[PDB]
Amino acid sequence: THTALDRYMELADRAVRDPSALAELPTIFAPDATVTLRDEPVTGMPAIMEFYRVFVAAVAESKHYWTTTILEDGTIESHWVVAARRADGSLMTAAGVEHATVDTDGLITNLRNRYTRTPG
Amino acid sequence: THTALDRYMELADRAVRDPSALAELPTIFAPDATVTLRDEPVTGMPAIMEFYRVFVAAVAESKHYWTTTILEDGTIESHWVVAARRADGSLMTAAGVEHATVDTDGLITNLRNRYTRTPG
Numbered sequence: 001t002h003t004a005l006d007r008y009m010e011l012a013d014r015a016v017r018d019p020s021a022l023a024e025l026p027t028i029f030a031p032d033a034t035v036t037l038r039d040e041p042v043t044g045m046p047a048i049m050e051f052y053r054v055f056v057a058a059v060a061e062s063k064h065y066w067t068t069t070i071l072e073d074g075t076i077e078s079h080w081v082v083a084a085r086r087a088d089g090s091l092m093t094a095a096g097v098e099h100a101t102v103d104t105d106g107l108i109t110n111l112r113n114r115y116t117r118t119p120g
Numbered sequence: 121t122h123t124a125l126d127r128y129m130e131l132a133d134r135a136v137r138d139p140s141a142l143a144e145l146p147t148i149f150a151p152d153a154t155v156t157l158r159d160e161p162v163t164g165m166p167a168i169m170e171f172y173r174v175f176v177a178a179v180a181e182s183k184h185y186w187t188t189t190i191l192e193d194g195t196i197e198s199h200w201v202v203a204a205r206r207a208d209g210s211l212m213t214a215a216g217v218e219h220a221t222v223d224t225d226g227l228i229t230n231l232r233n234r235y236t237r238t239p240g
């Protein structure tokens with residue numbers, strides 16, 4: 001599928017290679033969207049772009065796999081996995097589920113993640 | 121580095137895409153090598169080829185990252201991570217450390233893995 005959450009997942013690995021790919025974020029998130037990956041919310045495009053710049057700077061190379069469903073209420077859910085080499089040379093894996101609220105244009109207004117395998 | 125263990129790790133993902141890449145295994149393992157990935161040893165080229173054929177059949181797509189060191193005694197050690205989509209559509213991650221004995225030609229005579237993150 002190619003929902004905004006799919007487009008977001010696709011971006012993840014691309015932006016690690018090429019961080020200027022993050023200029024695509026306004027085609028994924030509504031402006032004034034809120035994102036909570038672990039514990040802290042980040043709201044609005046400027047803060048969202050900087051949070052993801054910082055995020056992808058800490059990663060040397062990554063690969064994500066995911067599966068996406070649209071729930072009863074129109075919420076989008078994606079189960080995902082990652083493997084990566086961090087910028088410090090350490091290796092990591094993680095796995096989780098992301099839940100997105102979308103607006104009538106299909107862009108994400110609220111993104112939440114819960115880990116089923118914490119990054120390690 | 122490009123030890124035989126590196127070439128083994130590099131083959132992993134290529135063979136999931138194209139299983140005929142496993143004809144490269146005789147350039148990685150000594151004939152009569154032993155491999156123990158989890159609990160059961162597989163010995164010799166014919167058995168090793170078949171074990172890996174079955175292994176990569178259960179995987180739709182994967183990505184490994186690894187780091188390799190040559191220990192004091194000449195044993196090769198690689199820390200690795202993987203993310204993958206399995207042939208049943210399930211997602212997985214795992215992480216471990218592989219230790220290889222090599223022979224004088226540099227081919228692996230004995231390969232052993234110990235998971236630090238079991239497949240899940």
Ligand SMILES: CC(C)=CCC[C@@]1(C)Oc2ccc(C(=O)O)cc2C[C@@H]1O
Pocket residue numbers: 008009011012013015037052055056064080082094098113119
């Ligand atoms: C940078 C971007 C556009 C998307 C990130 C996707 C995403 C699934 O990837 C990771 C990777 C590691 C980690 C980690 O915590 O190291 C967390 C996530 C959740 C993110 O939403």
Ligand SMILES: CC(C)=CCC[C@@]1(C)Oc2ccc(C(=O)O)cc2C[C@@H]1O
Pocket residue numbers: 128129131132133135157172175176184200202214218233239
């Ligand atoms: C097929 C081949 C040539 C190499 C496999 C490498 C390797 C690191 O990859 C996995 C992946 C999953 C798993 C798993 O158990 O699902 C185990 C391993 C150990 C293997 O040695």
